[PDB]
Amino acid sequence: SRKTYTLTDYLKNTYRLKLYSLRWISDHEYLYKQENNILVFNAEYGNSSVFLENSTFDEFGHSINDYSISPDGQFILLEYNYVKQWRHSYTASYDIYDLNKRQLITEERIPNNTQWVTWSPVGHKLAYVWNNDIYVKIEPNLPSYRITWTGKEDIIYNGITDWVYEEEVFSAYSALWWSPNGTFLAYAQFNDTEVPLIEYSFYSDESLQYPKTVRVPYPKAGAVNPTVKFFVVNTDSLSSVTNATSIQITAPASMLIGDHYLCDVTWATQERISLQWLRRIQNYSVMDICDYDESSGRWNCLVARQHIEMSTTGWVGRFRPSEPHFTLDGNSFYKIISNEEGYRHICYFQIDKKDCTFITKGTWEVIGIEALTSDYLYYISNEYKGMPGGRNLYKIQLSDYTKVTCLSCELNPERCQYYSVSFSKEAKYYQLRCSGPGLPLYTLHSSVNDKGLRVLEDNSALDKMLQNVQMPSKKLDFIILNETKFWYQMILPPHFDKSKKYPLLLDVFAGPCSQKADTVFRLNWATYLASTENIIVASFDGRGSGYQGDKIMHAINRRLGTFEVEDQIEAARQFSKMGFVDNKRIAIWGWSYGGYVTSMVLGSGSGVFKCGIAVAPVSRWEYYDSVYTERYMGLPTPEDNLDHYRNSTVMSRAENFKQVEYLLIHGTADDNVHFQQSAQISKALVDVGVDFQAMWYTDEDHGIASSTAHQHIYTHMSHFIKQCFSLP
Amino acid sequence: SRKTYTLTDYLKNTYRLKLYSLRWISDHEYLYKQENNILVFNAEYGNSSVFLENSTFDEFGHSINDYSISPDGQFILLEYNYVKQWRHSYTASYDIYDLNKRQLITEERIPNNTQWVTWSPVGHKLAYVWNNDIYVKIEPNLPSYRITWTGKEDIIYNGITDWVYEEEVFSAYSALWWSPNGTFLAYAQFNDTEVPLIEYSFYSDESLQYPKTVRVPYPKAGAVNPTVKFFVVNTDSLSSVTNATSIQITAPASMLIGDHYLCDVTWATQERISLQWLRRIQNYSVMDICDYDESSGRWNCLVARQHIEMSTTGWVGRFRPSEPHFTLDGNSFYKIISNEEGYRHICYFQIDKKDCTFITKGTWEVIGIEALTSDYLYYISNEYKGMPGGRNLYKIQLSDYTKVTCLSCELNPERCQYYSVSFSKEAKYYQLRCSGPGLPLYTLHSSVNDKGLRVLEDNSALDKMLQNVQMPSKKLDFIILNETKFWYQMILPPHFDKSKKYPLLLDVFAGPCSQKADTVFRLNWATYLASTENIIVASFDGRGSGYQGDKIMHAINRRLGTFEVEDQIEAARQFSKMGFVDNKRIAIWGWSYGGYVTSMVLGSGSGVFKCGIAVAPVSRWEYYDSVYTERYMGLPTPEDNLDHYRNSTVMSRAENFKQVEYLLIHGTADDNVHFQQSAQISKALVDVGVDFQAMWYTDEDHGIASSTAHQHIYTHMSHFIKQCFS
Ligand SMILES: *[C@@H]1O[C@H](CO)[C@@H](O[C@H]2O[C@H](CO)[C@@H](O[C@@H]3O[C@H](CO)[C@@H](O)[C@H](O)[C@@H]3O)[C@H](O)[C@H]2NC(C)=O)[C@H](O)[C@H]1NC(C)=O
Ligand SMILES: *[C@@H]1O[C@H](CO)[C@@H](O[C@H]2O[C@H](CO)[C@@H](O[C@H]3O[C@H](CO)[C@@H](O)[C@H](O)[C@@H]3O)[C@H](O)[C@H]2NC(C)=O)[C@H](O)[C@H]1NC(C)=O
Ligand SMILES: *[C@H]1O[C@H](CO)[C@@H](O[C@@H]2O[C@H](CO)[C@@H](O[C@@H]3O[C@H](CO)[C@@H](O)[C@H](O)[C@@H]3O)[C@H](O)[C@H]2NC(C)=O)[C@H](O)[C@H]1NC(C)=O
Ligand SMILES: *[C@@H]1O[C@H](CO[C@@H]2O[C@@H](C)[C@@H](O)[C@@H](O)[C@@H]2O)[C@@H](O[C@@H]2O[C@H](CO)[C@@H](O)[C@H](O)[C@H]2NC(C)=O)[C@H](O)[C@H]1NC(C)=O
Ligand SMILES: *[C@@H]1O[C@H](CO[C@@H]2O[C@@H](C)[C@@H](O)[C@@H](O)[C@@H]2O)[C@@H](O[C@@H]2O[C@H](CO)[C@@H](O)[C@H](O)[C@H]2NC(C)=O)[C@H](O)[C@H]1NC(C)=O
Ligand SMILES: *[C@H]1O[C@H](CO[C@@H]2O[C@@H](C)[C@@H](O)[C@@H](O)[C@@H]2O)[C@@H](O[C@@H]2O[C@H](CO)[C@@H](O)[C@H](O)[C@H]2NC(C)=O)[C@H](O)[C@H]1NC(C)=O
Ligand SMILES: *[C@@H]1O[C@H](CO)[C@@H](O[C@@H]2O[C@H](CO)[C@@H](O)[C@H](O)[C@H]2NC(C)=O)[C@H](O)[C@H]1NC(C)=O
Ligand SMILES: *[C@@H]1O[C@H](CO)[C@@H](O[C@@H]2O[C@H](CO)[C@@H](O)[C@H](O)[C@H]2NC(C)=O)[C@H](O)[C@H]1NC(C)=O
Ligand SMILES: *[C@H]1O[C@H](CO)[C@@H](O[C@@H]2O[C@H](CO)[C@@H](O)[C@H](O)[C@H]2NC(C)=O)[C@H](O)[C@H]1NC(C)=O
Ligand SMILES: *[C@H]1O[C@H](CO)[C@@H](O[C@@H]2O[C@H](CO)[C@@H](O)[C@H](O)[C@H]2NC(C)=O)[C@H](O)[C@H]1NC(C)=O
Ligand SMILES: *[C@H]1O[C@H](CO)[C@@H](O[C@H]2O[C@H](CO)[C@@H](O)[C@H](O)[C@H]2NC(C)=O)[C@H](O)[C@H]1NC(C)=O
Ligand SMILES: *[C@@H]1O[C@H](CO)[C@@H](O)[C@H](O)[C@H]1NC(C)=O
Ligand SMILES: *[C@@H]1O[C@H](CO)[C@@H](O)[C@H](O)[C@H]1NC(C)=O
Ligand SMILES: *[C@@H]1O[C@H](CO)[C@@H](O)[C@H](O)[C@H]1NC(C)=O
């Protein structure tokens, strides 16, 4: 008896992981939305109270997609008519509800199709973007103040990023930053005038007679990049001057010498802001620390306060320069950077001193700085057990770096080895989120002694259900190649028997700084394959992978499509040597970068793989965006790295595909890795007469995440894999 | 016992059908192009001479893909730098070789990127279109006369057709008609200003960093159509210091009242031109007959002299109203029209008489009028043996309609039941072109006594090769669908045994006035499927088929996606019970309209078909072009036919696809049946949770005819079919 974890179970989300989403409104309380009623909790005792009743907005005439209470808790921003755009961006309508009088504001309302809205960090001021222009509202019911007039569709962006800045630089749509108390409003401006447009059809609903053409300013490798400008305006002078001037903070000269980017902006104090810039050739980065000059009204950035951060073996940062964490007085800060041993650690900076002081160990890395107090600095790292795929919360004593404590390592070592954290406004409390290898466990803690106040969610319900199913196991481990260890993970079928030979599916990504082997617990396609189809699903983090030091991460610098690819092939060999793998049924599949690698492997001539599936794959780097691509590949010019750009394409290996069963899949509306990329792969396979399978997904983007589409692609892929392994 | 006809044989064109493409230059001679040269032949005796050896341009610096000899014989138009556009259209570079001096003309040459060129009908005058404007050269080496100045890319077309006129009306890129003696240059003008544009991406060569977007004025059902104007310019009058004057021929008022089309242009004499207009609602057309007036310089089209052709059961014409054949004095004419019973026959008209006189009749139809002499009217029909799928040349005595003679029926009955013809200028000689059921046979004859002069090409070489391969056979027969009989054909495997059970594949098209069951000999995919895979490939012509009368053809009027799909299923149903047909293994595939019908059948819930393949199918008529779609469906408005437009989509049948194995294929650069159509089919199947097989072909259009793609798609489809059949 006891059934297995079926494809339907996966697709219908029968076994759901319960979460405990919380939102800190103060240093002592947080909000917890219950799909109907949003109540506020007292961290100290856990007692609750309804903050906004379930029916408070019925008869609104619109479904509320999200709420956003202002800092002073006097107003709430109701978000509706949501319409996704790219990964983070989206458009929608907004209404402000006065809580002080249980009244909805019906005057000077925020425009329909607003692109972005943000409360000031204090009070209830509003700053929003509409038609690529920035507007500011001092009072919710009063007329807005326009800040920019240069806004222009697909050409000029004020307060919001263009496409590449959203996805690759800021991993965020917003391009404006309120100062801590809300006096100043800093924002960036992007000019995509000279940037080539990506164009693709969008079919929409059946009812559309003529397909629509989507055109998005998008710089492909080597193409013209958007240009950027930074401004700071004083919102306290809006109601006094009629057209408040936006002060521009330019340079650095070392940056203005050529193409560059604005990669980070964080306020240190009420009158101090830091700006990090990056050269197009991303091996050089510069941080400026500018102070408001009350006399000149301008913003000066002393060169003595300018910090250079470069890299000789690769690019700066994992995906971009590290973010700074200033001490309360804004005179010093903490930033993760790779030490002399190529390992990423926290080092302490003084704004006017160029040499920083490292405060963390060695053979492991700090993942991120989570909180800073007058006493300790809280951060997450993978030091525990020397497991690069594990994650824990530590705290180091600011006065004595030799004093480091792990607040999560021992809470429940068997069930929890991967943690994320969420502190209260002042770090008085913090929620710990354990995500594996056991079922997600959420707990609340007071920072005084790190005492565990209580368990917010332990997924006991789920646990009961899963004991009624032949669930698969997960093995996380390492192999040693060229005297260096490389981690991998396998999702073993129930009742694993090392004596039997199993068909293995190599789940891959292998992009720079990626990590596919961890302690995270997951209920996904692989879960079904192992549980029901008795298939071993493995992942391997080879050269180029991250969180293990630059020696490994920078291994593929300027050489994408090589080691990373070879290591996945070697991994299959290594897994075969373990004796429980069927040499005749080894498959491989990936998505995005995983698709690129899968494809490169499939067309490698290394007869290891029988079949493979590539989803939304990159086929040639000259087709992908500039920021991401050039970071690892440099420029596609003959004086730079053009040769390797051309030698690392998937099309150039078309002939080799005659010896493997291939399945190419791609959404036609993919704005990230354009359908074009697969379009050229199919065409190349056609030119050399190689048969293969294909599937396009109309109007789906890079995520192919529509409910029906999601279920269709996995259902389709299962058939392919089953057939390739002669199952069931 | 010998090899079979394999997929490679087909894809590689191992067994190639020989042809005899001649071009009549007079009433007595013709040109015969070859690989290394061009010869002139004497029809009377068969003797010939070398006109030029091509080696005349061994050092032209360009690869010529076509030659065009002035009717004069004095000049050769050399077409190179070919660049295909749509079905008939394309651009190209041109050079003119003066045969009198045997030298290339160096001055005033034709502009590169010329969209169209045509010699006048008699001398050596040239009319060409460049950048949407018309130009005329009176002498090959002389400066051109700018006829029009309004041309504008994608907006105004002078002398060439827009996408929809090229494809659905004139079946040609040309929109200019020289008068018989080359005095007048008639031409149409198209305004697409308000016509919506279909847009799609073209990826090009791997080296292209950014995909380019193709946009082309294309009216989908109910959209804003391009408007048209007609003009006539006297080429003997054009000055050089003055802009050429173009007289316009407008109306009819019964046409200007609403949307309409110019569907036919036919000169009657040196000074009389006829024009046929069709209302957007294609069940009413009017023919104007206009004569030039020297004193006023205008062209007058006397009312009363116009003829109305309308239909009450459907649309007018098979695809459009037929072309008129005017007598020598242009005072009368013959033209095919639908008689009272719905059959198409030849009707005799007097330019100023309202009713005409049918000179043919019966339950069969005249396919087309091929030649007219004071003595006879030569035409092709399917009267012989009552086989709608057969074609023979006949001649009817203009003095006594009782005397009709079949000129080809008996030449070789066993080998030939399908002919086409090519008469000399004045119909003194004619070339018969047999295309089935046996190997193609080309013969030359003389009209005086209908003597079989000589055999031009008998495909004897090919016949010797095929005798060494196990070729399949073809059975043409019919079934009775309550009262009426409907024809079908089956490509049968070698050594067919009615005792053995074979898998059947229903090859379908079934569009209005289509014919898939005929006596033509074909070397195609089905040949391989039957020859090598022993698969019976059938085809059926049900309600909607052509060449059998309006009762059959107009049955699907305003009702596409109904009777023709149901009948396709009825047929399959009866084939399955035949005994030598494995009812558990019946497939179905088609292209374009066939794709649509295949998809409609597969989503009908018949349970008759196991699997099916749809290539570049139409999914919903609102996505197809206006001229074709509207002709049968009317307008997609609630006052008209919107309801049926909505009830006849493929997506509406998604849920039914769960019971079958479907393969969807479509070229991404399809300008005809937009990739959009299959994108909407896949999306609807996904939304209903139906798994299917798919395959796109980047940068391939409606023909998916690039050499590699052609091979790939058939290779892909073959695997799919045998997989389904095993
Ligand atoms: C609030 O102040 C803004 C800062 O100057 C002002 O910016 C714009 O000012 C003018 C007006 O649109 C723009 O146009 C200029 O026109 C001259 C004359 O043709 C050109 O020589 C010049 O190159 C430019 O085109 C400016 O481009 C623009 N300046 C900036 C920095 O944005 C706002 O218009 C103003 N708002 C209001 C309502 O007055
Ligand atoms: C091709 O066909 C066009 C109409 O489809 C001709 O044009 C005419 O039609 C437009 C409206 O569609 C009229 O108005 C235009 O101008 C006004 C003001 O600039 C705009 O508000 C409006 O939207 C249109 O853009 C024009 O008045 C009318 N043209 C003329 C000259 O009156 C066009 O002329 C025709 N070309 C040829 C060579 O036939
Ligand atoms: C962002 O970048 C674009 C350039 O990519 C800026 O456009 C450029 O603006 C200048 C204004 O100094 C234009 O110059 C002007 O040209 C006209 C002739 O067209 C001339 O008469 C004027 O004297 C002046 O020289 C320039 O043409 C234009 N270039 C392009 C490519 O459009 C744009 O202004 C910038 N936008 C913002 C808000 O920063
Ligand atoms: C949560 O409940 C407290 C009540 O605290 C009580 O006293 C503690 C010692 C402990 O025994 C708790 O379990 C008891 O419930 C509320 O605190 C009140 O807050 C208001 C201001 O909002 C303050 O003026 C009162 O003095 C507080 N009451 C007490 C007894 O000190 C708190 O507001 C509750 N919050 C929610 C969200 O329900
Ligand atoms: C084709 O042949 C004729 C001549 O053929 C001969 O004469 C016939 C009348 C008949 O008796 C045949 O058996 C003979 O073989 C050519 O006629 C000549 O044409 C040229 C002009 O082209 C003219 O100068 C001559 O006077 C004609 N002579 C005759 C006999 O009429 C004809 O030109 C040949 N055509 C080709 C394409 O070679
Ligand atoms: C049609 O073009 C050809 C080729 O010209 C080249 O391609 C064109 C598309 C355009 O980009 C030109 O600038 C290119 O030079 C013309 O033929 C000549 O070709 C020779 C080289 O073979 C070149 O030196 C000449 O400049 C070209 N043009 C002339 C008139 O000399 C051709 O002439 C063009 N059509 C006509 C009739 O002018
Ligand atoms: C013939 O007509 C054309 C178009 O009307 C004339 O060419 C235009 O002349 C005007 C006035 O000089 C220019 O602004 C245009 O640029 C010209 N070209 C076009 C396409 O409009 C031409 O001059 C006329 N020729 C004569 C002698 O009447
Ligand atoms: C030509 O087609 C038109 C439009 O389809 C026919 O007119 C319509 O006929 C129907 C009767 O079935 C009426 O309900 C409509 O009101 C008529 N008007 C229109 C334009 O919709 C017309 O009868 C046809 N002509 C012929 C000769 O059959
Ligand atoms: C927070 O904003 C500024 C940050 O410096 C605070 O200081 C005032 O800043 C303005 C600049 O526009 C100066 O002109 C004033 O003189 C500053 N005030 C003082 C104390 O000198 C400001 O006080 C803060 N505002 C709020 C609302 O907290
Ligand atoms: C071809 O046709 C044109 C027009 O029909 C002929 O031109 C006419 O010739 C007569 C002389 O018999 C004149 O009276 C007319 O004025 C001409 N009409 C026009 C508009 O040109 C032309 O001569 C014919 N070509 C030949 C050589 O027969
Ligand atoms: C970061 O990498 C770039 C690679 O372009 C280096 O750029 C230049 O300097 C190299 C050696 O100093 C040369 O080998 C490169 O050719 C040159 N770049 C170009 C386009 O010619 C840069 O020095 C590196 N930065 C550091 C400090 O290592
Ligand atoms: C937003 O759009 C709706 C519907 O068109 C309209 O009723 C409403 O007034 C609009 N609100 C604003 C802020 O324009
Ligand atoms: C040794 O090199 C790398 C490690 O440096 C290892 O992954 C690889 O498999 C070995 N051989 C080669 C040439 O890749
Ligand atoms: C007659 O045949 C047609 C098509 O062959 C079919 O649709 C119909 O049901 C049959 N009987 C009647 C009464 O129409």
Coordinates of N, CA, C and O in Angstrom, one line a residue, chain A residues 364-393:
Chain A
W364 N 35.3 29.2 3.5 CA 33.8 29.2 3.5 C 33.5 30.6 3.1 O 34.4 31.5 3.0
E365 N 32.2 31.0 2.9 CA 31.9 32.3 2.6 C 30.7 32.9 3.3 O 29.8 32.1 3.7
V366 N 30.7 34.2 3.4 CA 29.5 34.9 4.0 C 28.6 35.1 2.8 O 29.0 35.6 1.8
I367 N 27.3 34.7 3.0 CA 26.3 34.8 2.0 C 25.8 36.2 1.9 O 25.6 36.8 0.9
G368 N 25.5 36.8 3.1 CA 25.0 38.1 3.2 C 24.9 38.7 4.6 O 24.8 37.9 5.5
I369 N 25.0 40.0 4.7 CA 24.9 40.6 6.0 C 23.4 40.9 6.3 O 22.7 41.6 5.5
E370 N 22.9 40.3 7.3 CA 21.4 40.4 7.6 C 21.0 41.5 8.6 O 19.8 41.9 8.6
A371 N 21.9 42.0 9.5 CA 21.5 43.1 10.4 C 22.7 43.6 11.1 O 23.7 42.9 11.3
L372 N 22.7 44.9 11.5 CA 23.8 45.6 12.2 C 23.3 46.3 13.4 O 22.4 47.2 13.2
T373 N 23.8 46.0 14.5 CA 23.5 46.8 15.8 C 24.7 47.4 16.3 O 25.8 47.4 15.7
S374 N 24.6 48.1 17.4 CA 25.7 48.8 18.0 C 26.7 47.7 18.6 O 27.9 48.0 18.7
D375 N 26.2 46.6 18.9 CA 27.0 45.5 19.5 C 27.4 44.4 18.5 O 28.6 44.3 18.3
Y376 N 26.5 43.7 17.9 CA 26.9 42.7 16.9 C 26.5 43.0 15.5 O 25.8 43.9 15.2
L377 N 27.0 42.1 14.6 CA 26.7 42.1 13.2 C 26.2 40.7 12.9 O 26.9 39.8 13.2
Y378 N 25.0 40.6 12.4 CA 24.4 39.3 12.0 C 24.6 39.0 10.6 O 24.4 39.9 9.7
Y379 N 25.0 37.8 10.2 CA 25.2 37.4 8.8 C 25.0 36.0 8.6 O 24.9 35.2 9.6
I380 N 24.8 35.6 7.4 CA 24.5 34.2 7.0 C 25.8 33.7 6.3 O 26.4 34.4 5.5
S381 N 26.2 32.4 6.5 CA 27.3 31.9 5.9 C 27.1 30.4 5.7 O 26.2 29.8 6.2
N382 N 28.0 29.7 5.0 CA 28.0 28.3 4.8 C 29.1 27.6 5.5 O 29.6 26.5 5.1
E383 N 29.6 28.2 6.6 CA 30.7 27.6 7.4 C 30.4 26.3 8.1 O 31.2 25.4 8.1
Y384 N 29.2 26.2 8.6 CA 28.9 24.9 9.4 C 29.2 23.6 8.6 O 28.7 23.5 7.5
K385 N 29.9 22.8 9.3 CA 30.3 21.5 8.8 C 31.0 21.6 7.5 O 31.1 20.6 6.7
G386 N 31.5 22.8 7.1 CA 32.2 22.9 5.9 C 31.3 22.5 4.7 O 31.8 22.0 3.7
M387 N 30.0 22.8 4.8 CA 29.1 22.5 3.7 C 28.7 23.7 2.9 O 27.8 24.5 3.3
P388 N 29.3 23.9 1.7 CA 28.9 25.0 0.9 C 27.5 25.2 0.5 O 27.0 26.2 0.1
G389 N 26.7 24.1 0.7 CA 25.3 24.1 0.3 C 24.4 24.3 1.5 O 23.2 24.1 1.5
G390 N 25.0 24.5 2.7 CA 24.3 24.8 3.9 C 24.2 26.2 4.2 O 25.0 27.0 3.7
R391 N 23.3 26.7 5.0 CA 23.1 28.1 5.3 C 22.8 28.3 6.8 O 21.8 27.6 7.3
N392 N 23.5 29.2 7.5 CA 23.2 29.4 8.9 C 23.4 30.9 9.3 O 24.1 31.7 8.7
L393 N 22.7 31.3 10.4 CA 22.8 32.6 10.9 C 23.8 32.7 12.0 O 23.7 32.0 13.1

